[PDB]
Design a protein around this ligand. Sequence first.
Ligand code: CA
Ligand code: CA
Length: 279
Amino acid sequence: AAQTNAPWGLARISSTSPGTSTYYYDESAGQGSCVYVIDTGIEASHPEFEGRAQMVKTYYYSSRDGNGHGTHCAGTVGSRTYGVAKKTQLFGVKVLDDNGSGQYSTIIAGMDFVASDKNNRNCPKGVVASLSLGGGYSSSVNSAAARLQSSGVMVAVAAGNNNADARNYSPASEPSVCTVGASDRYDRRSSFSNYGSVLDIFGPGTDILSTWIGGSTRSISGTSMATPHVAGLAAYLMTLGKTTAASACRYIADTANKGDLSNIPFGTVNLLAYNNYQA
Ligand SMILES: [Ca+2]
Ligand SMILES: [Ca+2]
C-alpha cells in the first residue's frame, strides 16, 4: 500500500533516504496487534481512529484526554491518516493529567495495569506499549518498565527532550525497553533529543502532524512523537510475523537505516527506524 502526501515521518520510516512523501507499507497494517498508549488519554471518538481506539483505564476523574498529547501519540501509532500501523487496536491508559503531568506512583500503576490487562484482550499478533513520558531517574519507574517488557509487551519509551544523556531519565534509562530518540526531516538528531548509550533507535520527532483533541490535528515536536512511530512499527512488524515483543526493539535496530543521521554524539547509535517495505 502507498499513502501519498503522507506526513514526513511516515514517509521517512519507509524510505532509505530523506525527502520522500509517500509512505509505503504492507496492507496488513498492524491488524491483530494492540498498542497501549500510556499518556493523557486518547480522544477515542476522533474519526481518524475509526473506532479502533478505546480508553481502558484512567487514574484521574475522567478518562478524557483534556490535553491532546495522548491523542497525538495514539494518532502516530495508528490513526488512518497519521499512523504507522493503520489497523492496530489502540488502548488508552491515562496516567497523566490534563496538564501532562503525573506522579511516578501513577505511572508505575499504569504500567502494571497494562501487564495484566493484556491478558484480557484479544491481541493475537502481540502487544505494544508506547510511553511518551519521562522524568528524572527512578529505579522504581525503570523496574516498572522492565516488568512490563518482561510480561511480553514491547515497551517503547521516549528518550526525553533535555538534549542530555538519557541515562539520567526514566524510564528512558531502563536498558531492557526500547528507548527512542528523535530526528528531524533533514535526518538530524532533533535539537532537543536526549542521546547516549541507552538509546536503541531514532524515529521522526520534529514537526509531526497527528491527531489532536476536538477532532482536530496539529504538528508538535518531541521524543514523545518519535516513540509512537517506533511503537507503531513494532506492531506492524509483529503483525507481519517478522519479530515478537521480546525481540522487536533489536529487530528494529538490526533492520534500521544506519549511519544516516547527523549530530549524533559519539556513543549514541545512528540508527533510524525503517520498515524495509518492498512492494
Ligand atoms: Ca540512507
Ligand atoms: Ca534498550
